Amino acid sequence: GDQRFGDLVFRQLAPNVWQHTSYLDMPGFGAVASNGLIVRDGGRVLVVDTAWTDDQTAQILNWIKQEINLPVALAVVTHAHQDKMGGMDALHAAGIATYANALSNQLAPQEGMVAAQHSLTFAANGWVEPATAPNFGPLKVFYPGPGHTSDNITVGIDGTDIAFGGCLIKDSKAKSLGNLGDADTEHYAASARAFGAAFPKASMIVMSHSAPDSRAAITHTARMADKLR
Ligand SMILES: COC(=O)[C@H](CS)NC(=O)OCc1ccccc1
Ligand SMILES: [Zn+2]
Ligand SMILES: [Zn+2]
């Protein structure tokens, strides 16, 4: 079940995988949840996405200390919006190595974000260039194409049935795609489908603004995105 820890929520998804959830009271939109991931890989911990704020992200690290008690080797953040990168300074203060799409790091200052320390680059087929993602262990990083944003990336967890779509994917009962302010409306559907095709064995889809779902999250998201064209 859910574990309330301060103002955040943690949920175990698999033996070595937990979802972190944090909230930002956005005026005119209510208190918006955003999810990321925590993965134990042997004697270290890997984080996918910050919380909305530095303080919340420090709380993620506090939860990790109390519930796992192993060092956080790295974090990867999945685009340059506040829900994914708002807590970068907290990661740096903690001495954690940070990674983002090169384009996310380029965009970070104008989006009001602090850039990650390291830039990921991607092959033409979307897979991360391995040299730019050293020591990522089971994290398999994939750029599906522009969709939710131009820079959005996705992460599969090798050895599990989990893939993380970030803010690209919404669940199978969602009425909308969420924040389309920086979206590529022409390419969104194809990018959602490319995410699915990159992680064909993933039966649990995790995403930023819905609870974990089946692969129907991918098909429904793509079908909704068809309407943008
Ligand atoms: C500061 O906002 C954010 O970081 C995220 C980035 S994806 N935006 C968000 O969650 O917007 C909430 C929203 C806005 C319009 C329509 C649906 C949801
Ligand atoms: Zn976003
Ligand atoms: Zn988001």
From Swiss-Prot:
- Give me the residues that bind Zn(2+) 2, please: D83, C167, H209
Report residues binding Zn(2+) 1: H79, H81, H148
- Give me the reactions it catalyses: a beta-lactam + H2O = a substituted beta-amino acid
Q: According to its UniProt record, where is this protein mainly located?
A: periplasm
Q: Which UniProt keywords apply?
A: Antibiotic resistance, Hydrolase, Metal-binding, Periplasm, Plasmid, Signal, Zinc
What Enzyme Commission number(s) does the record list for this chain?
Answer: 3.5.2.6
Q: Which GO terms describe its molecular function?
A: beta-lactamase activity; zinc ion binding
Per UniProt, substrate binds at K170, N179
**Compartment list:** Periplasm
> What does the record list as GO biological process?
antibiotic catabolic process; response to antibiotic
Q: Return the similarity comment.
A: Belongs to the metallo-beta-lactamase superfamily. Class-B beta-lactamase family.
Job of this protein: Confers resistance to the different beta-lactams antibiotics (penicillin, cephalosporin and carbapenem) via the hydrolysis of the beta-lactam ring. Does not confer resistance to the polymixin colistin or the fluoroquinolone ciprofloxacin.
Additional comment? Enterobacteriaceae carrying this gene (identified by PCR) have been isolated in Sweden, India, Pakistan, Bangladesh, England, Scotland, Northern Ireland, Australia and the USA. The organisms they were identified in were K.pneumoniae, Enterobacter cloacae, E.coli, Proteus spp, Citrobacter freundii, Morganella morganii, Providencia spp and Klebsille oxytoca. In India most isolates were from community-acquired infections rather than hospital-acquired infections, indicating the gene is widespread in the environment.
Q: What is this protein called?
A: Metallo-beta-lactamase type 2
- Native organism: Klebsiella pneumoniae
Q: Which residues of the full protein are shown?
A: 42 to 270 of 270
